[PDB]
Structure formats: structure tokens, C-alpha cells
Design a protein around this ligand. Sequence first.
Ligand SMILES: CC(C)(COP(=O)(O)OP(=O)(O)OC[C@H]1O[C@@H](n2cnc3c(N)ncnc32)[C@H](O)[C@@H]1OP(=O)(O)O)[C@@H](O)C(=O)NCCC(=O)NCCS
Ligand SMILES: CC(C)(COP(=O)(O)OP(=O)(O)OC[C@H]1O[C@@H](n2cnc3c(N)ncnc32)[C@H](O)[C@@H]1OP(=O)(O)O)[C@@H](O)C(=O)NCCC(=O)NCCS
Ligand SMILES: *C(=O)CCCC[C@@H]1SC[C@@H]2NC(=O)N[C@@H]21
Lengths: 82, 537, 537
Amino acid sequence: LAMLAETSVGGLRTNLAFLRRILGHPAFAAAELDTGFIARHQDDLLPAPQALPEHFWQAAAEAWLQSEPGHRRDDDPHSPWS
Amino acid sequence: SHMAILHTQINPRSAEFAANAATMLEQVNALRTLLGRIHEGGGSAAQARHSARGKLLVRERINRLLDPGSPFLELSALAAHEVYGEEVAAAGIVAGIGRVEGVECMIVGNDATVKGGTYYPLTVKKHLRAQAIALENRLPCIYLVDSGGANLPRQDEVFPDREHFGRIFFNQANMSARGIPQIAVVMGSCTAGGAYVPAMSDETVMVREQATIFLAGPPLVKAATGEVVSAEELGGADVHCKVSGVADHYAEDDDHALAIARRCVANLNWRKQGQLQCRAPRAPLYPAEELYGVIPADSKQPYDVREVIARLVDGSEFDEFKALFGTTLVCGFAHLHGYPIAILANNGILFAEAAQKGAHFIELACQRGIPLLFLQNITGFMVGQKYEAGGIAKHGAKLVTAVACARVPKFTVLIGGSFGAGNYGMCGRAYDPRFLWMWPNARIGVMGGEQAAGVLAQVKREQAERAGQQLGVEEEAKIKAPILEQYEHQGHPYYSSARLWDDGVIDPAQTREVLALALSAALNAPIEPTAFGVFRM
Amino acid sequence: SHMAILHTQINPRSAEFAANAATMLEQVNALRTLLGRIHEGGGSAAQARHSARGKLLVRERINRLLDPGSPFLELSALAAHEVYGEEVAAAGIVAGIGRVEGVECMIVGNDATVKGGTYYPLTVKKHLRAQAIALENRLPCIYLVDSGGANLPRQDEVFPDREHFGRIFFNQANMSARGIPQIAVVMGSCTAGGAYVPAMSDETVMVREQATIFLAGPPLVKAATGEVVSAEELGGADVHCKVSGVADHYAEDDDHALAIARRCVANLNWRKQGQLQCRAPRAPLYPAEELYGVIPADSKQPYDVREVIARLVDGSEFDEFKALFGTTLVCGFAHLHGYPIAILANNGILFAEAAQKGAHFIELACQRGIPLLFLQNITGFMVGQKYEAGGIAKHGAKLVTAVACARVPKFTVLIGGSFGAGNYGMCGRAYDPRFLWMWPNARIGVMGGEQAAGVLAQVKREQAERAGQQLGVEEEAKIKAPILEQYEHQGHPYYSSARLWDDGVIDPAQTREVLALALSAALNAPIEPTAFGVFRM
Ligand SMILES: CC(C)(COP(=O)(O)OP(=O)(O)OC[C@H]1O[C@@H](n2cnc3c(N)ncnc32)[C@H](O)[C@@H]1OP(=O)(O)O)[C@@H](O)C(=O)NCCC(=O)NCCS
Ligand SMILES: CC(C)(COP(=O)(O)OP(=O)(O)OC[C@H]1O[C@@H](n2cnc3c(N)ncnc32)[C@H](O)[C@@H]1OP(=O)(O)O)[C@@H](O)C(=O)NCCC(=O)NCCS
Ligand SMILES: *C(=O)CCCC[C@@H]1SC[C@@H]2NC(=O)N[C@@H]21
């Protein structure tokens, strides 16, 4: 589960999300194993979407801003305008 | 260089410090909140009736045009404060410098919300003050045109004269000739006057179904040989992009129009011509916040300037010239965010040796091409009978010559008092410093409140004395009352920034970072060699 | 800048596409194959006879001289093609720009195999045209002299006039004065005329027992006061390196000579003068060969040039000026291999609008110091009674002044038709573009085939009409026949490039590759400020 959280794939539809929670579902803790399992807790592992909090938007905005250094002019690098 | 350090003598925990720092911070909060009121433009009222037409607001247009998170130095925000009868928010024109495609640019846009965006006398003054900073520092211009016309009732102070409207066009065609791009973004009405801002411009952009550039709008045009035509048909967006050629780019809306704009600044092949031996930036050694408490609250209470110096320079390293001589004026070399600078800061009165000290400094500075930084807190020149017989007159002159002629970049900031001859000998407004700023605590005037009421009333009883009478404490006191209050009123920052005597009131603990922004910006223009006039020895 | 992108509308798969692509590509192989024949020189025949004397061949001397795998821009390869009676490959001299010790150099060498390497008129025309590119762009000069003399039979077009032989020396003394070194390598006969190329050159090198520089060789000198002596005795390599001092370097053979050469180009303390704000080089968004199919095969079937631009600019990003105004002329900014450039491509006719659009654009490129690229495919200026009474006359002139005066590097490629006024307003040969190229499908003439035949035949029946008669389709048709063909002939790329009206015919699909080469080389020399004449408003 450790590995699944340190892994990151972007720019495509991935099941990386699904797995993370199927190793974490309490059913998987106990031997509640059979071949219907994936069907059973179907809800628990394929939740319905939602444009989650501003909580997000905020960070995503601050993160985006921090990953474009602006521009550094050869003219005066130290320029505080960057 | 562990010798060029300024070890502080201020205790940040003292009670006296907390006292000053107190009423200082209040002052700043005072400004803070006003500046917010001014952000409202013509008030939620029509400001919302703006967005109505699907038009982006002024300051919004600016943030969209700027570079992702670029800083923005705003100019004379307190413009026209309590000046005109009505409220004319930042004089109905917001201007400032900001990064646009990696270029420090001068931006000006009108607040359509403020009394129809028309030009009141000061709107014009602010506009022109911007083109100055622009020509003086070679910053390409971006005019976000959205104005009515010129404020019809006060035209006498808005149309004729030299530095009146129309001098906007003058500076413009001259800037395009001295090779400083002139970009125009039309996002509203633009009848008559401002009709030239986009007509006279290297590159021009129009927002369809919204932009309108015509000499005489339908009101005027109907008032002509009759004829009744609509805005869109007379001089709309489609008329000047597809027909006449007064515009160059056909933008679909405010957001598009600015995007088009960015692009122009992008194909500028622009390169900075300034040139200094800037060194790596190293922060000061004392929180620049601590300034709040270094500055006494008791206006005419003695403090050591080097303290303010130590909280702005790099690594608070400062090498002092003529260390112990006419100490009334402190002079030294240091660096600020890399950029090396030569400083001249008042520390009291100003005897003869202080100006010879300062004039001699300005020669060394102007000889190495290092920017000049003036920190005013001058009450005046020491007067007296021996003092006058000593040339405190001609030596003072020596200083001003040096200042008036210095051609390297000059920067002034008022942190105390601009009073009398002092203001001039320290690069006051009239000596064209690239930028002039004012602290909340500083006050400016020809001479003290009662000082002027002193003389002004003295003569009244000198002319009435050799006229066989005398001034009774009843009339004399009524002579000084009106003065003592007038002076107190026009000595205040708001009154000053309101009339553009300075490019704005700033946060004392932000100074350091304003100077860096400025200095860098002024390096878009070559540091020219200096030629001094005759020195009265 | 995902909006400054040009989205094609070309289907590389379409039938129509491969149709054009077909005839285009055929034309390129037509050129590919003739180009090879001209690499023959004086033919396998004497060519082998050359190598026999132990002399490296011309085009090989060049390959050896250049830097490991450096590129090489050859000039007017079709020189003198089907021009003089005989066949004179590349006019007996190959020249072009190539790297030598990290410096973009102008290299000129003669083909001792083509009619003795002597100078036919076009030889002088081409040699001269190189020193022009040398001067105009400040590229040092390497002359690989190995020629007989001047082609005696056709001297009346090789010796007298301003731009004839001897102007060769002029140009050399002048460039030497303007500090563009002049280097010479004597690897053959060097009688009389070409005798000065080696004597007038900062540095000179001679191949022993092979090179000979004498004002009058043994033929002439015996025809003098009798006297009979050998070539190497008269003016060999040992005579001029050990005794006279007309040479500076004593080389062992062709290969050594070239080695000594390079070494001179090494201690040139050379620095480039140009200066643009070039950015990182990004490739286009569409295969450059797609062009073969962008260009109609139907001579006068309209197409959109923006499709052509899209395949040369970096990341097919193009910022278009006066986007929708005088659409017949396309203008915009973008870059090519990093270097910023301003484009002016024809998209049809050229009504007043276009001209104004263009003049105005040039003004902007000229003010920002950005090089201009012209893309000709102009059929002419729209004629008529209104169009004429509308000043399509004077408007067109505003365009020419602009072009004529622009002092920024200018580049011209003929990708359509240069016919009439058009050729001029679009920076034709007569306007000093640093370089001017021609695609194989391009046709250049004073005006169309029957166009001329039209007027030229019509006056004949106007002089003969007010002469009490008329011209029956009998003589009328015989007055048109000759002209119709003459023009078809004098309009083809070979006909042009053989006379140097262009620095060559190139591969449409390589245009970008050559444009960047040129530009770079043109930056060995400063971009000057521009001064405009009077503009007829
Ligand atoms: C500019 C104009 C299109 C305004 O359009 P709008 O967005 O509908 O704005 P409004 O008409 O509601 O104008 C509202 C304010 O504009 C002010 N105003 C507009 N033009 C003005 C002018 N030239 N002088 C003085 N005030 C003017 C009005 O006083 C009004 O004030 P108020 O809000 O306190 O009542 C319209 O006023 C106009 O056509 N003016 C022409 C100006 C002109 O011809 N000037 C030539 C001199 S250079
Ligand atoms: C240059 C020279 C040494 C040639 O030596 P080479 O290597 O044996 O070459 P060739 O003698 O075989 O010359 C062959 C070609 O050179 C041509 N040629 C040489 N000099 C020429 C000249 N000055 N004018 C015209 N043609 C000339 C001949 O026409 C001949 O043409 P062809 O091959 O079609 O028959 C010999 O021609 C000579 O001495 N010429 C002197 C040139 C001169 O005096 N010019 C002064 C005018 S500035
Ligand atoms: C081919 O179609 C030539 C067009 C003829 C029109 C006339 S001839 C040259 C004049 N200049 C120009 O641009 N067109 C005019």
C-alpha cells in the first residue's frame, strides 16, 4: 500500500486509484476472499465522483503558481521582478 | 567586510520602541484601509453595472494581463483624494509597472466606473506622470483605453496648456520615435480626446461589440449636420479592423484583447540597456519590520538615520564617506538587492559642511555611475548671522547643482520632513528623481506651521508699526490661526499623494523591496554620463 | 502561446494534395539533376586533366577547407546556364558561405577546368555578387585563385565599366579597410587580371611549383621585349615567397595550402556584430516537405500563404498584424530557429490597403530591429479607374520607400510570381535584400506572357488606326506570337538564376533550413538604425 501511494501516473485514465483502496478495504484485511469480491463491495471501491472542496482549488492554485519561476532576464538576473 | 556592518542600538523589546512602532503601524493601517476604499472605483454601484456589459473591471484587466504572479508597483493611488467635490477614485486611472512577457512595463487603464472614465484635471496629471516614468526609464507602454472624454465642466484645466491633455499624444509619438513601443488595448468608449491614444500607437487592439473609437460620438455627431447613427456603426470594432485600419487586432472580448496584447510585448526583441556591477542579493541583518519602532512618534524628536539604513541595504553593510564631518548629513555606499547604490540621508539640521560633503559625494557617485538614494528628513538650513556670512548660502547652492545635474538614476523617499531649501537640496520632486515616495509619518511644506504664521504675522505688525500703530494680540492671533491650520492640512501625505507630488505613499517596512523593484526597472534605460554646471566656489 | 498557432487545413492525404506535391517534387528532381551536371565543371575530360597536374579539384578544395561537416550555402549554381554559346559550369567559379575555424566565411574559388577558369562576364558578375554578400554581412573572405585571365573574346563586358573586373579589387581594398580580412590562396595560374587578387589581400598563400602570380605571363612577356623564360621562373611560388614578397605563405600543395589558410582564419580575433533577442529554437508543427503539396500546380489557382508560413516558423506560431485588413498582404511576427523575424507574404493582389498595412508593419519591424522576410507571389497592383483615382499609386509608393529604406537585414524568397510593381514593393532584387532565393515553380517577369503581348500588339493597331487602317488578325497574331513565347522563356528560374537575378533556386522544402543559415551569417554584421525618406501621405 506504501508503494501504491509513492507511485504516481498522470495524463491518462488509470486503475492506480482503484487498487489503492482495494488493498485498504477492511474486507481485504480478513480472508473475505472469493471471486465475487470485486463485484460485492462494488460501491466501496468505485465511488461516485464530486468536484471536491475549495480546499483543493486553493492548494492546486498555489502549487501551480509555484511551478513557473516567472522569467529571469539575462539583463539583470537578480531582478526582483521575477 | 565584517567592518562595514551597522550593529543596531535599538532594542526591539523596549517600551519606547513598542510605543513608536505602535502609532506607526496605526498610520500604516490607516493607509491600508483607504487604499481599499479606492479599490472600489466608482463604488459597487455602477462598478457592478460595468461587469453588466460583460466588461472586466480595471484592476482585473491588469492582473490578467500581468505575468503569473508578477509584482505590480502602483502609482499615486491616493490620486485626487478629497480633491474634487465628488469622489474620483485613484483619479479614474490606475497605472503601475509590472512584468508582461518578461519586460518591466508601464501600464495605464481607465476606470470606466469612476465618473464615466472621463479625464479630470488630475486624471491627466497621473496619465502624464506615467509616461514620464516610462520615457525616463524606457519601459514600453500598454494603454488599456476605456474612457469617456475629458470632464467637460473642468476643461479649463484639462485641455489647453502645455502639460494638459494632448501632451499625452505628444509624449506618445516621441516615445515611439525614441523606440519605446506604444501598445493600445481599447475595451470601451473612446470618444474624441482619448480617440488618439489608440490612433497614435505602434500596435492597437479592439474588443468587438464594445470598443468604439470615433472623433465625435453620436451625441456630438447628431449635434453636427443632424444624422443619427449608432455607436457600433460610426466607429465600432468591426469598422476599424476591417475598414479604416485604425485598429490592428480584432479581439473577441476583454480576456482575448489582453492575450493579444501580451503577444505584442512578446515580439518586441527588447533588451535592457542599463548596466551596473550588481552583486549577488543578500538580505539585511534586521527585520525590515523593526523600522516601525526606529522612527520616533514625536515628529520633532532626534533619532539616528543609520538605523533605517541598516534595515534596507544588503547585509546591513554600509561604508561611510566623510564619516565624521558635517554629520548632519550621512553619506555612504552599499548595495540593495544586488544593485550598488550611493546614499544621502539627513540626520538633522544642515550646516555648510554638510552640503559640501554631499556635493562631493554626488561627484564620486556620478563618477562611477552608481544610483543615488535620498532619504529626506530635513527641517532646514541652520540660520544665523555668522552662518549666513559663512556662505551657508553658496555652499547650499553647491549641493543643488550637483543634485540637479546628476544624471545617474536618482531615487527619493520622504521619511521625515521635507521643509524649505531642504527639499531641493535632497532631490525633491522638482529634480526629477526617477521615483519619489512618501512614508505615512512624513510631512511636507515650505516651512513649519507656526514658522510661516510667525513671519506672515510679523510683517503685518511691522508695516503697521512704522504706520504709527501696533498689532494687538487680538488681531495677530486671528492672523496666525488660519495659517497654523492650513499648514497642518497641506503637510500630510494624503494631501500630497492626492496631487501627485509623489508617486505614492508606501509602507515603511516595505521600502527596501520597492527600491529594488524601481532600481531594476530603471535599468531598462542606460546610465548616462553626467555634466555639472558651474560650481559656485 | 497555444493561440499563436497556425492550424492547417491541408490534408496531406487528399488527392489534390499529392497532385501538386507531384509536379512540385518533379521540378525539384529537375533541379537536383541539373545541379549534378554542373558539378561536372569542364567535364570529365579536362577535369581529369586537372587532377593530373596534381591539383585538387575546385569543389574538393572547398570541402577540405571547411570545418568537419560544416554546412555550405552555395551561390548561383545555375550561373551562366545556357547563357554563353559554350557550357560554362557555375560560370567557372563556385562560391558560398561555410564555417572555417568557427567563423561564417565567404569562399570563392575558380574552376580551372571551366574554359581555363578564365572570366566570362557572368564570372565577374558572380565573383562580385559574393563580395557584396561579404560586405553586406561582414564575413571574412577566402579567395581560392586558380584562373587564367579574363575571357579575351568577350572583354568589352569584362574589363571597362564600374561593375566589371577591377571592381573586384575595389571591393577588396574597401573591405580590408572596413576590417573584414581578405585572404588569398594561389593554387594555379594567376596571370594579369587575377594577379591582383593575391597581391591585394591582407594575407596570401602559394603552392610551390604550381602557383604563379605574374602581371604578364610568358605568352605576353615574349610578346614584350622578346625575352623567353618559364612560368616558375617568371613568377612562381619561390620567386614571390623568398624574394618579392607578393606572397606570405609557402605551401607544399593544395592540401597544405588550405591548412595554412584555415590557420589564418584562426588568429582573426573575430567577434560577431549582430545582436537580436533570439530564443531557444523550436521546430515547426508540420513536416517541411508537406510544402510540395501546399503549392498548387495550377499556376494561377489561389492558395493561402499562412500554410507556407506555418511550415517554416518555429512551433508554427505566427502573430498576425492588421489581421483582417488589406488581406491580400499577410503580415506578422514569429521566429525562425530562434532568431525573431517579421514576415510579409503576398496573398493575392495588392490594393491600397495592403500597401499601407505593409508600410506600417515595416515601420514596426524597423523600430524593434527585427529582420524582414518577404514572400513574393504577387501578380500585381489592382488596376482600374476608381482604384487609380484612389491613390493605389501613391499608396504603393509608401510601401517601397519603407522597404527601400529599411536597414534591418532583409530576406527575399520567390514562392509564386514576381510580376511588375509587385516585385519592387516586396523587396525584389533591386532593394538589396542580403539574400534573395527562388523556388522552382516561381516565375519572374515585367508582366504576364500575353499581358505584354496584349499592350505591345494593341498600340500597333492604334497607331495604325488613327492611320486610316487596322490590323487584321493576320499581322496582329504574328505580332503576338514571338512575345508570348519570349516571356514564357524569360520567366523560368533557370533563366533567372543563370543571370544572377537571384542567389539561386532552392528546394521549397528546405527554405527554413536556408533561411536560418543566412540569418545567422547576416549577424556577423550589426543591424543598423533605419532612416526613412519622405512618405507621400
Ligand atoms: C462617455 C459616454 C459614452 C458615457 O457612456 P455611459 O457608459 O453610458 O456613461 P453615462 O452616460 O452613464 O455617464 C455617467 C457619468 O459620466 C459623466 N460624463 C460623461 N462624459 C462626460 C464629460 N465629457 N464631461 C463630464 N462628465 C461626463 C456624467 O457626468 C455622468 O456622471 P454621473 O454618473 O455622476 O451622473 C457619454 O457620456 C458620451 O458620449 N460622452 C461624450 C464625451 C465627449 O464628447 N467628450 C469630448 C471632450 S474630449
Ligand atoms: C592560362 C593559360 C596558361 C592556360 O593554361 P592551361 O592550363 O594549359 O589551359 P589551356 O591552355 O589548355 O586553355 C584551355 C582553355 O583556356 C581558354 N583560355 C585561356 N586563356 C584565355 C583567355 N585569356 N581568354 C579566353 N580564353 C582563354 C582557351 O579558350 C581554352 O578553351 P578550350 O579548352 O575550350 O579550347 C594560357 O591560356 C595563358 O597563358 N593565358 C594567359 C591569359 C591572359 O594573358 N589573359 C590576360 C587578360 S586579363
Ligand atoms: C500580370 O498579370 C501583370 C499585371 C499587369 C498589371 C500592371 S503591369 C505592371 C504594373 N504593376 C503592377 O503591380 N501591375 C501593373
